[PDB]
């Protein structure tokens, strides 16, 4: 239950409610996402977010 923001446009990811407007599914934690994984914003890897 850890939430991340991205540091480069400024977003914050809600694992609660996932992400279904790339796909996820509203039961995927932020462990749980796809290593093919991009910000919904730009499109950066995991490493451009950071905990809130
Ligand atoms: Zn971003």
Not at 7 to 35: H, I, M, Q, R, W
Request: aromatic fraction near 12%; glycine fraction near 10%; hydrophobic fraction near 30%.
């Amino acid at each position: 239950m850890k939430k991340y923001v991205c540091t480069v446009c400024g977003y914050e990811y809600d694992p609660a409610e996932g992400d279904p407007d790339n796909g996820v599914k509203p039961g995927t934690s932020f462990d749980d996402l796809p290593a093919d994984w991009v910000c919904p914003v730009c499109g950066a890897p995991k490493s451009e977010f950071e905990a809130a």
